[PDB]
């Protein structure tokens, strides 16, 4: 279920952010401005 | 005009540390809630080339 991590400061589009997910060991990364869901997870 | 340094920060840059924040805020300390005016001095800046 656990799926990978977000990194930064202020989490939400302020800042640039560290996005890590993860498919057990395919792992899926990229560090924009991102603005997620604001309440975290993998939008299946 | 458009080559631009942020004349001032809050703390110096790690090495390497990329740093594409906007916010007017101070070149020092007086309280100035995002508006420019005297101390509130935006630190991003630009040359007249
Ligand atoms: C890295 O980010 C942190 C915030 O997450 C910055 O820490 C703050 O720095 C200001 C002064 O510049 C202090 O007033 C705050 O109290 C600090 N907060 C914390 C939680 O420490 C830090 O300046 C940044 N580092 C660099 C090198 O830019
Ligand atoms: C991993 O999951 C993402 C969606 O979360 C998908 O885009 C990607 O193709 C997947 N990669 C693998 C090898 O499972």
Known sequence: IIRGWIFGTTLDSKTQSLLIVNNATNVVIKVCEFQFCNDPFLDV | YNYRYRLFRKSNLKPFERDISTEIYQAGSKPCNGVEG????????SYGF
Request: aromatic share 38%; with cysteine; charged share 0%.
């Open chain 2, 38 to 45: 005297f101390n509130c001095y935006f630190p991003l800046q």
